[PDB]
Amino acid sequence: SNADNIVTTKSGSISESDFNKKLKENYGKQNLSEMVVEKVLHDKYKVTDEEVTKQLEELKDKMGDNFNTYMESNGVKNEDQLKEKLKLTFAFEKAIKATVTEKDIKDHYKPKLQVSHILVKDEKTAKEIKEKLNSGEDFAALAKQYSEDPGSKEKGGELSEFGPGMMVKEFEDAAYKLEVGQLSEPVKSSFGYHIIKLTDKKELKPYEEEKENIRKELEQQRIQDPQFHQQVTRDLLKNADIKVSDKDLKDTFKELEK
Amino acid sequence: SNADNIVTTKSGSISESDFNKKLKENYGKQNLSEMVVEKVLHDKYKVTDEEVTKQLEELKDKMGDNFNTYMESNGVKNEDQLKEKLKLTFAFEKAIKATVTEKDIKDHYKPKLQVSHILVKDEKTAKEIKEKLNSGEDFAALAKQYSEDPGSKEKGGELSEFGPGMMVKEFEDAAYKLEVGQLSEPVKSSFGYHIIKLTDKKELKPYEEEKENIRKELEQQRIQDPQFHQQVTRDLLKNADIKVSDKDLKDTFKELEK
């Protein structure tokens, strides 16, 4: 019964009752949180047995003899339990992929830009250089004279072609406001102050032939960002209309406010 | 009853039965381990209410208004619960202090040594210097000529007086084998190769007037070393003659083997 010991020691025994009460007091909330999140992910994003058995076989071949040792190091004791971990992980990813909207994909359908840039440490030098450019001095020559970027000062300030999300927002936004041959205003970044010149604006395949690739890149970009793992968790729980009836676990979703 | 919900969501409800079963499966062992360790520490090393109430008041004054906010950030909701944390921490320290034996205190009752040293990068240069010393060349002069130690090459290789446990074992052991005026053999350390000369061997107060200080230093030295927190935990559990009767929690003290 509840008053019967579950362990004996030379320091005394512990009843199943005291054990169960202590357990709910120190893990009740963490366990309810996990349980509800797992119940919502399997509800909103179903994963099939094929997608999980497949991922498992690809892990068995890679692990080999080191598999039976790895499975026991994750609170898992059966292959059915490891599938549950793999399945929960795959549902979580489907949840993140679902946060990618048309607008997010359109904001990234922009042509790759071929630009040159001059990097100086202070804003004073940047305005001075921007004035020599207005006077008609050669951008490639000024980049050889003042740029601090070792990988572009010898090559007229040329940078490898780039596209959306590949550069710092301040640098990117300034570059897409330019027309071929136009110069930017001094742009501040962590390395100092930049002057951007657009030399070429690469062609762009139709939208309907790029949305697939754009979507996959955003999807993978969010899967690595743990900022989205916290965002997706938080949103699934708020949209779950959670109501705890157990008095001891009432303030489990306490910090879900935001 | 057990079939009654403890939470409702738009993704479905969870019964108290499923909740309790899932809880024991994902925290049963971690909770049993903690519970037994806490039961052994309060059994072998009693802490009084004065030692805990006192430590608490010293924490209230330091925390001030930031206290009511700190207490809620440690899974604690009452002052009686915070005392339990403080008490467990004080019992754990008493456990570590108890690992200090007479032999450990005697091995540290040694006189402080005043030595000079020459530091070179290779063993070849060390033997060459050790030979110039045998020939009768001045140690202070050779330290000015070859030592790599910026803080002692200009001062004849002099080092501040030191005692047991303050230096690397290889350096310390070599220094206590010397008599005033004797030179060591080349000693290897992380910085290279050393040649030690003992210039003075400071006086030492009687053993009975030093064991108190020696004991306190070893006690505090082990309280910071987490190598002892794992050692004391492991030993208290092995000396507890633990026997788990619950089948689901049988392999909780599985990895206690050593």
Coordinates of C-alpha atoms in Angstrom, one line a residue:
Chain A
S1 CA 0.0 0.0 0.0
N2 CA 1.0 3.7 0.3
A3 CA 2.5 3.2 3.8
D4 CA 4.8 0.4 2.4
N5 CA 8.5 1.2 1.8
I6 CA 9.9 1.6 -1.8
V7 CA 13.6 1.7 -0.5
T8 CA 15.5 0.9 2.7
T9 CA 18.8 2.4 3.8
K10 CA 20.9 2.5 7.0
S11 CA 19.6 6.1 7.3
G12 CA 16.0 4.9 7.1
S13 CA 13.3 3.9 4.6
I14 CA 11.0 6.1 2.3
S15 CA 7.2 5.2 1.9
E16 CA 5.6 5.2 -1.6
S17 CA 3.3 8.0 -0.3
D18 CA 6.1 10.4 0.8
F19 CA 7.9 9.5 -2.5
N20 CA 4.9 10.3 -4.7
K21 CA 4.1 13.6 -2.8
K22 CA 7.8 14.8 -3.0
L23 CA 7.8 13.9 -6.8
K24 CA 4.7 16.0 -7.6
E25 CA 6.1 18.9 -5.6
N26 CA 9.5 19.0 -7.4
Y27 CA 8.5 17.9 -11.0
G28 CA 4.7 18.3 -11.2
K29 CA 4.9 21.6 -13.2
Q30 CA 7.9 20.7 -15.4
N31 CA 6.1 17.4 -16.3
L32 CA 2.7 19.1 -17.0
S33 CA 4.4 21.7 -19.2
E34 CA 6.2 19.0 -21.2
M35 CA 3.1 16.8 -21.4
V36 CA 0.8 19.6 -22.7
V37 CA 3.4 20.8 -25.3
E38 CA 3.8 17.2 -26.6
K39 CA 0.0 16.8 -26.7
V40 CA -0.4 20.0 -28.8
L41 CA 2.5 19.2 -31.2
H42 CA 1.0 15.7 -32.0
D43 CA -2.5 17.3 -32.3
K44 CA -1.5 20.2 -34.7
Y45 CA 1.3 18.5 -36.7
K46 CA 0.9 14.7 -37.2
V47 CA 4.1 12.7 -38.1
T48 CA 3.7 9.2 -39.7
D49 CA 5.4 6.0 -38.6
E50 CA 7.2 5.9 -42.0
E51 CA 8.9 9.3 -41.3
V52 CA 10.0 8.1 -37.9
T53 CA 11.0 4.4 -38.7
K54 CA 13.0 5.8 -41.7
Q55 CA 14.9 8.4 -39.6
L56 CA 15.6 5.6 -37.0
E57 CA 17.1 3.1 -39.5
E58 CA 19.3 6.0 -40.9
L59 CA 20.5 6.5 -37.2
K60 CA 21.1 2.7 -36.6
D61 CA 23.4 2.4 -39.7
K62 CA 25.4 5.5 -38.7
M63 CA 25.6 4.5 -35.0
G64 CA 26.3 0.8 -35.6
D65 CA 27.5 -1.0 -32.4
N66 CA 27.6 2.4 -30.6
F67 CA 23.8 2.6 -31.0
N68 CA 22.7 0.2 -28.1
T69 CA 25.0 2.4 -25.9
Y70 CA 23.5 5.8 -27.2
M71 CA 19.9 4.8 -26.8
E72 CA 20.3 4.2 -23.1
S73 CA 22.0 7.6 -22.6
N74 CA 18.7 9.6 -23.4
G75 CA 16.2 8.2 -20.8
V76 CA 15.0 5.8 -23.6
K77 CA 15.0 1.9 -23.1
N78 CA 13.0 0.8 -26.2
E79 CA 13.0 1.6 -30.0
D80 CA 9.3 2.6 -29.6
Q81 CA 10.5 5.3 -27.1
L82 CA 13.3 6.6 -29.3
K83 CA 10.7 7.0 -32.1
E84 CA 8.6 9.2 -29.7
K85 CA 11.7 11.5 -29.3
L86 CA 12.3 11.6 -33.1
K87 CA 8.6 12.1 -33.8
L88 CA 8.3 15.0 -31.2
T89 CA 11.5 16.6 -32.9
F90 CA 9.9 16.3 -36.4
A91 CA 6.6 17.8 -35.2
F92 CA 8.5 20.7 -33.6
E93 CA 10.2 21.4 -37.0
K94 CA 6.9 21.2 -38.9
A95 CA 5.6 23.8 -36.4
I96 CA 8.5 26.2 -37.2
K97 CA 8.2 25.6 -41.0
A98 CA 4.5 26.7 -40.6
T99 CA 5.6 30.1 -39.2
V100 CA 6.9 31.0 -42.8
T101 CA 4.2 33.1 -44.5
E102 CA 3.9 34.3 -48.2
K103 CA 5.0 37.8 -47.1
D104 CA 8.2 36.4 -45.5
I105 CA 8.9 34.6 -48.9
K106 CA 8.2 37.7 -51.0
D107 CA 10.4 40.0 -48.8
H108 CA 13.2 37.6 -49.8
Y109 CA 12.4 37.5 -53.6
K110 CA 15.0 40.2 -54.5
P111 CA 17.8 40.2 -57.1
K112 CA 21.4 39.4 -56.0
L113 CA 23.5 42.6 -55.9
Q114 CA 27.1 43.0 -57.1
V115 CA 28.5 46.0 -55.0
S116 CA 31.9 47.6 -54.1
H117 CA 32.4 49.2 -50.7
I118 CA 35.0 51.5 -48.9
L119 CA 35.4 50.8 -45.1
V120 CA 36.8 53.5 -42.8
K121 CA 36.7 53.7 -38.9
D122 CA 35.1 57.2 -38.4
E123 CA 32.1 59.1 -39.9
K124 CA 34.4 62.2 -40.5
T125 CA 36.5 60.2 -43.0
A126 CA 33.4 58.7 -44.6
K127 CA 31.9 62.2 -45.4
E128 CA 35.3 63.3 -46.7
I129 CA 35.4 60.2 -49.0
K130 CA 31.8 60.7 -50.0
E131 CA 32.7 64.3 -51.1
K132 CA 35.8 63.1 -53.2
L133 CA 33.3 60.7 -55.0
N134 CA 30.9 63.6 -55.7
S135 CA 33.9 65.5 -57.1
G136 CA 34.3 62.6 -59.6
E137 CA 37.2 60.7 -58.0
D138 CA 37.4 57.0 -59.1
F139 CA 35.7 54.7 -56.5
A140 CA 38.2 51.8 -57.1
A141 CA 41.1 54.3 -56.6
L142 CA 39.6 55.7 -53.3
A143 CA 39.1 52.0 -52.1
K144 CA 42.8 51.4 -52.7
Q145 CA 43.7 54.6 -50.8
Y146 CA 41.4 54.4 -47.7
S147 CA 39.5 51.1 -47.4
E148 CA 40.3 49.1 -44.2
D149 CA 38.9 45.8 -45.7
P150 CA 42.0 43.7 -46.5
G151 CA 40.0 41.5 -48.8
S152 CA 38.7 44.3 -51.1
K153 CA 41.0 47.3 -50.9
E154 CA 43.3 45.8 -53.6
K155 CA 40.3 44.9 -55.8
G156 CA 38.5 48.3 -56.1
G157 CA 36.4 47.4 -53.0
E158 CA 34.6 44.5 -54.8
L159 CA 32.5 42.1 -52.7
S160 CA 31.2 38.7 -53.7
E161 CA 27.5 38.9 -55.0
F162 CA 25.0 38.7 -52.1
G163 CA 21.2 38.6 -51.5
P164 CA 18.6 39.0 -48.8
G165 CA 19.5 38.0 -45.2
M166 CA 23.2 37.4 -46.1
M167 CA 24.3 40.8 -44.8
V168 CA 23.7 43.0 -41.8
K169 CA 20.3 44.8 -42.1
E170 CA 21.8 48.3 -42.2
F171 CA 24.2 47.3 -45.0
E172 CA 21.5 45.3 -46.9
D173 CA 18.8 48.0 -46.7
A174 CA 21.2 50.7 -47.9
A175 CA 22.3 48.5 -50.9
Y176 CA 18.7 47.8 -52.2
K177 CA 18.0 51.6 -52.2
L178 CA 20.7 52.1 -54.9
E179 CA 20.4 52.0 -58.8
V180 CA 23.4 50.7 -60.9
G181 CA 26.2 53.3 -60.5
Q182 CA 24.6 55.2 -57.5
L183 CA 26.6 55.6 -54.2
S184 CA 25.1 55.2 -50.7
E185 CA 25.5 57.6 -47.7
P186 CA 27.9 56.5 -45.0
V187 CA 26.5 53.3 -43.4
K188 CA 27.4 52.4 -39.8
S189 CA 28.2 48.7 -38.9
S190 CA 30.3 46.9 -36.2
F191 CA 33.5 47.3 -38.4
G192 CA 33.0 51.1 -38.8
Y193 CA 31.5 53.2 -41.6
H194 CA 30.9 52.0 -45.2
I195 CA 30.2 53.7 -48.6
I196 CA 28.4 51.3 -51.1
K197 CA 28.5 51.5 -54.9
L198 CA 26.1 49.2 -56.9
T199 CA 28.0 48.0 -60.1
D200 CA 25.5 45.2 -61.3
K201 CA 22.0 43.9 -60.4
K202 CA 21.9 40.2 -61.4
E203 CA 18.8 38.8 -63.3
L204 CA 16.1 37.0 -61.3
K205 CA 14.1 33.9 -62.4
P206 CA 10.3 34.2 -62.1
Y207 CA 8.8 34.3 -58.6
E208 CA 6.9 30.9 -59.1
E209 CA 10.3 29.2 -59.8
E210 CA 12.1 30.7 -56.7
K211 CA 9.4 30.5 -53.9
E212 CA 10.3 26.8 -53.3
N213 CA 14.1 27.5 -52.7
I214 CA 13.3 30.7 -50.7
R215 CA 10.9 28.8 -48.5
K216 CA 13.4 26.0 -47.8
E217 CA 16.2 28.5 -46.8
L218 CA 13.9 30.4 -44.4
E219 CA 12.6 27.1 -43.0
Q220 CA 16.2 25.8 -42.3
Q221 CA 17.2 29.3 -41.1
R222 CA 14.5 29.2 -38.4
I223 CA 15.2 25.5 -37.4
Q224 CA 18.7 26.5 -36.2
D225 CA 17.6 29.8 -34.5
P226 CA 16.6 28.8 -30.9
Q227 CA 14.7 32.2 -30.8
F228 CA 12.0 30.5 -32.9
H229 CA 12.0 27.3 -30.8
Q230 CA 10.9 29.6 -27.8
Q231 CA 8.5 31.5 -30.1
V232 CA 6.7 28.4 -31.5
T233 CA 6.5 26.8 -28.0
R234 CA 5.0 30.0 -26.5
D235 CA 2.5 30.4 -29.4
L236 CA 1.3 26.7 -29.4
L237 CA 0.6 27.0 -25.6
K238 CA -1.2 30.3 -25.8
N239 CA -3.5 29.0 -28.7
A240 CA -4.2 25.9 -26.5
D241 CA -6.7 27.6 -24.2
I242 CA -5.0 25.9 -21.2
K243 CA -7.0 25.5 -17.9
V244 CA -5.4 23.6 -15.0
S245 CA -7.9 22.2 -12.4
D246 CA -5.3 20.7 -10.0
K247 CA -4.7 23.2 -7.2
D248 CA -1.0 22.2 -6.7
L249 CA -0.3 22.7 -10.5
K250 CA -2.4 26.0 -10.9
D251 CA 0.6 28.3 -11.6
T252 CA 2.4 25.9 -14.1
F253 CA 1.7 28.1 -17.2
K254 CA 2.2 31.2 -14.9
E255 CA 5.0 32.8 -17.1
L256 CA 3.0 32.3 -20.4
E257 CA 1.6 35.9 -19.9
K258 CA 3.5 37.1 -23.1
Chain B
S1 CA -10.9 10.3 -9.2
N2 CA -7.9 9.1 -11.3
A3 CA -10.0 9.3 -14.6
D4 CA -10.8 13.0 -13.9
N5 CA -9.0 15.7 -15.9
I6 CA -6.3 17.9 -14.3
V7 CA -6.1 20.2 -17.3
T8 CA -8.2 20.9 -20.4
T9 CA -6.9 22.3 -23.8
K10 CA -8.2 22.7 -27.3
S11 CA -5.8 19.8 -28.1
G12 CA -7.5 17.7 -25.4
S13 CA -7.4 17.0 -21.7
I14 CA -5.0 14.9 -19.5
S15 CA -6.3 12.7 -16.6
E16 CA -4.6 12.6 -13.2
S17 CA -3.7 8.9 -13.8
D18 CA -1.8 9.5 -17.1
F19 CA -0.2 12.6 -15.5
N20 CA 1.0 10.6 -12.4
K21 CA 2.3 7.7 -14.6
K22 CA 4.2 10.0 -17.0
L23 CA 5.7 11.9 -14.0
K24 CA 7.1 8.7 -12.3
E25 CA 8.5 7.5 -15.6
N26 CA 10.4 10.8 -16.3
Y27 CA 11.4 11.9 -12.8
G28 CA 11.0 8.9 -10.5
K29 CA 14.7 8.1 -10.5
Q30 CA 16.0 11.7 -10.3
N31 CA 13.6 12.2 -7.3
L32 CA 14.5 9.0 -5.5
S33 CA 18.2 9.8 -5.9
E34 CA 17.7 13.3 -4.4
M35 CA 15.4 12.1 -1.7
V36 CA 17.9 9.4 -0.4
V37 CA 20.9 11.7 -0.5
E38 CA 18.9 14.3 1.5
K39 CA 17.8 11.6 4.0
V40 CA 21.4 10.5 4.5
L41 CA 22.9 14.0 4.9
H42 CA 20.2 15.0 7.6
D43 CA 20.9 11.6 9.3
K44 CA 24.8 11.7 9.4
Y45 CA 25.2 15.5 9.8
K46 CA 22.5 17.3 11.9
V47 CA 22.2 21.1 11.4
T48 CA 20.3 23.2 14.0
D49 CA 17.5 25.7 13.4
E50 CA 19.8 28.5 14.9
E51 CA 22.5 27.8 12.2
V52 CA 19.8 28.0 9.5
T53 CA 17.6 30.9 10.8
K54 CA 20.9 32.9 11.3
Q55 CA 22.1 32.3 7.7
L56 CA 18.6 33.3 6.5
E57 CA 18.5 36.7 8.3
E58 CA 22.1 37.4 6.9
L59 CA 20.6 36.8 3.4
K60 CA 17.4 38.9 4.1
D61 CA 19.5 42.0 5.1
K62 CA 21.8 41.6 2.0
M63 CA 18.9 40.9 -0.4
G64 CA 16.5 43.5 1.1
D65 CA 13.5 44.2 -1.3
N66 CA 15.2 42.0 -4.0
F67 CA 14.6 39.0 -1.6
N68 CA 10.9 38.3 -2.1
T69 CA 11.9 38.1 -5.9
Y70 CA 14.9 35.7 -5.4
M71 CA 13.1 33.2 -3.1
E72 CA 10.5 32.5 -5.8
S73 CA 13.3 31.9 -8.4
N74 CA 14.5 28.7 -6.7
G75 CA 11.3 26.4 -6.6
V76 CA 10.8 27.8 -3.0
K77 CA 7.5 29.5 -1.9
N78 CA 8.0 29.7 2.0
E79 CA 10.8 30.7 4.4
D80 CA 10.6 27.2 5.9
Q81 CA 11.4 25.8 2.4
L82 CA 14.4 28.2 1.9
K83 CA 15.7 27.0 5.3
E84 CA 15.6 23.3 3.9
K85 CA 17.8 24.4 1.0
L86 CA 20.2 26.3 3.4
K87 CA 20.2 23.3 5.8
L88 CA 21.0 20.7 3.0
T89 CA 23.8 23.0 1.8
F90 CA 25.3 23.2 5.4
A91 CA 25.0 19.5 5.9
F92 CA 26.8 18.8 2.6
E93 CA 29.7 21.1 3.8
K94 CA 29.9 19.3 7.2
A95 CA 30.2 16.1 5.1
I96 CA 33.2 17.5 3.1
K97 CA 34.8 18.9 6.3
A98 CA 34.6 15.3 7.8
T99 CA 36.7 13.9 4.9
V100 CA 39.8 15.8 6.4
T101 CA 41.9 13.3 8.4
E102 CA 44.8 13.8 10.8
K103 CA 47.2 12.4 8.1
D104 CA 45.9 15.1 5.6
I105 CA 46.6 17.8 8.3
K106 CA 50.1 16.4 9.1
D107 CA 51.1 16.2 5.4
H108 CA 50.5 20.0 5.3
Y109 CA 52.5 20.8 8.5
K110 CA 55.7 21.8 6.7
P111 CA 57.8 24.9 7.0
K112 CA 57.3 27.7 4.4
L113 CA 60.3 27.8 1.9
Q114 CA 62.2 30.8 0.5
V115 CA 63.6 29.6 -2.9
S116 CA 65.0 31.1 -6.1
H117 CA 64.5 29.4 -9.5
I118 CA 65.8 29.6 -13.1
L119 CA 63.1 28.9 -15.9
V120 CA 64.2 27.7 -19.4
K121 CA 62.1 26.1 -22.2
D122 CA 64.2 22.9 -22.9
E123 CA 65.8 20.2 -20.8
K124 CA 69.1 20.6 -22.8
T125 CA 69.5 24.2 -21.5
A126 CA 68.5 23.1 -18.0
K127 CA 71.4 20.4 -17.9
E128 CA 73.8 23.0 -19.3
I129 CA 72.8 25.6 -16.5
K130 CA 72.9 22.9 -13.8
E131 CA 76.5 22.2 -15.0
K132 CA 77.5 25.9 -14.8
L133 CA 76.1 25.9 -11.2
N134 CA 78.2 22.8 -10.3
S135 CA 81.3 24.7 -11.8
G136 CA 80.5 27.4 -9.1
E137 CA 78.8 30.1 -11.2
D138 CA 76.6 32.4 -9.2
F139 CA 72.9 31.3 -9.3
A140 CA 71.6 35.0 -9.2
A141 CA 73.9 35.8 -12.2
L142 CA 72.7 32.7 -14.2
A143 CA 69.0 33.7 -13.4
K144 CA 69.7 37.2 -14.9
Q145 CA 71.3 35.5 -18.0
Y146 CA 68.9 32.6 -18.8
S147 CA 65.6 32.7 -16.7
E148 CA 62.4 33.2 -18.8
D149 CA 60.4 34.3 -15.7
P150 CA 60.0 38.1 -16.1
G151 CA 59.1 38.5 -12.4
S152 CA 62.3 36.9 -11.0
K153 CA 65.1 37.1 -13.7
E154 CA 66.0 40.7 -12.5
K155 CA 65.9 39.6 -8.8
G156 CA 68.3 36.6 -8.8
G157 CA 65.3 34.2 -9.5
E158 CA 63.7 35.0 -6.0
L159 CA 60.1 33.8 -5.5
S160 CA 57.7 34.9 -2.7
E161 CA 57.8 32.4 0.3
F162 CA 55.4 29.5 -0.3
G163 CA 54.1 26.4 1.6
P164 CA 52.2 23.1 0.9
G165 CA 49.5 23.0 -1.8
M166 CA 50.4 26.5 -3.1
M167 CA 52.6 25.2 -5.9
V168 CA 52.4 22.5 -8.6
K169 CA 53.3 19.0 -7.0
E170 CA 56.4 18.4 -9.2
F171 CA 57.8 21.9 -8.1
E172 CA 56.7 21.5 -4.4
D173 CA 58.1 17.9 -4.0
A174 CA 61.5 18.9 -5.5
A175 CA 61.7 22.0 -3.2
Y176 CA 61.1 20.0 0.1
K177 CA 63.9 17.5 -0.9
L178 CA 66.5 20.3 -0.6
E179 CA 68.6 21.6 2.3
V180 CA 69.5 25.3 2.6
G181 CA 72.0 26.1 -0.3
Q182 CA 71.3 22.9 -2.2
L183 CA 70.2 22.9 -5.9
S184 CA 67.5 20.6 -7.4
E185 CA 67.7 18.6 -10.7
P186 CA 65.8 20.1 -13.7
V187 CA 62.0 20.0 -12.8
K188 CA 59.4 19.9 -15.7
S189 CA 56.3 22.0 -15.4
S190 CA 53.8 23.6 -17.9
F191 CA 56.1 26.6 -18.3
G192 CA 59.1 24.5 -19.2
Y193 CA 62.1 23.3 -17.0
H194 CA 63.1 24.8 -13.6
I195 CA 66.2 24.7 -11.4
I196 CA 65.4 25.3 -7.7
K197 CA 67.8 26.7 -5.0
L198 CA 66.7 26.8 -1.3
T199 CA 68.0 30.0 0.3
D200 CA 66.0 29.9 3.6
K201 CA 63.6 27.5 5.5
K202 CA 61.3 29.7 7.7
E203 CA 60.5 28.7 11.4
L204 CA 57.4 26.7 12.2
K205 CA 55.1 27.2 15.3
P206 CA 54.3 23.9 17.2
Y207 CA 52.0 21.4 15.5
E208 CA 49.2 21.9 18.2
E209 CA 49.1 25.7 17.4
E210 CA 48.8 25.1 13.5
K211 CA 46.5 22.1 13.1
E212 CA 43.4 24.5 13.5
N213 CA 44.5 26.8 10.6
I214 CA 45.7 23.9 8.5
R215 CA 42.3 22.1 9.0
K216 CA 40.3 25.2 8.0
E217 CA 42.3 25.8 4.8
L218 CA 41.9 22.1 3.7
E219 CA 38.2 22.3 4.7
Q220 CA 37.6 25.5 2.5
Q221 CA 39.8 24.1 -0.3
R222 CA 37.6 21.0 -0.6
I223 CA 34.3 23.0 -0.3
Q224 CA 35.2 24.8 -3.6
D225 CA 36.5 21.7 -5.4
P226 CA 33.4 20.0 -7.1
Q227 CA 35.6 16.8 -7.3
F228 CA 34.8 16.4 -3.6
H229 CA 31.1 17.2 -4.0
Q230 CA 30.9 14.1 -6.3
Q231 CA 33.2 12.1 -4.0
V232 CA 31.2 12.8 -0.8
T233 CA 27.8 12.2 -2.6
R234 CA 29.1 8.8 -4.0
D235 CA 30.5 7.7 -0.5
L236 CA 27.4 8.7 1.5
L237 CA 25.2 6.6 -0.9
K238 CA 27.5 3.5 -0.9
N239 CA 27.6 3.5 2.9
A240 CA 23.8 3.7 2.9
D241 CA 23.2 0.0 2.0
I242 CA 20.5 1.1 -0.5
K243 CA 17.8 -1.5 -1.6
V244 CA 15.0 -0.3 -3.9
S245 CA 11.8 -2.5 -3.8
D246 CA 9.8 -0.6 -6.5
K247 CA 10.3 -2.4 -9.8
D248 CA 10.1 0.8 -11.9
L249 CA 12.9 2.4 -9.8
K250 CA 15.2 -0.6 -9.4
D251 CA 18.1 0.8 -11.5
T252 CA 18.1 4.3 -9.9
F253 CA 21.5 3.8 -8.1
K254 CA 22.6 1.8 -11.2
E255 CA 25.8 3.9 -11.8
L256 CA 26.8 3.8 -8.1
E257 CA 29.1 0.8 -8.9
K258 CA 32.3 2.8 -8.2

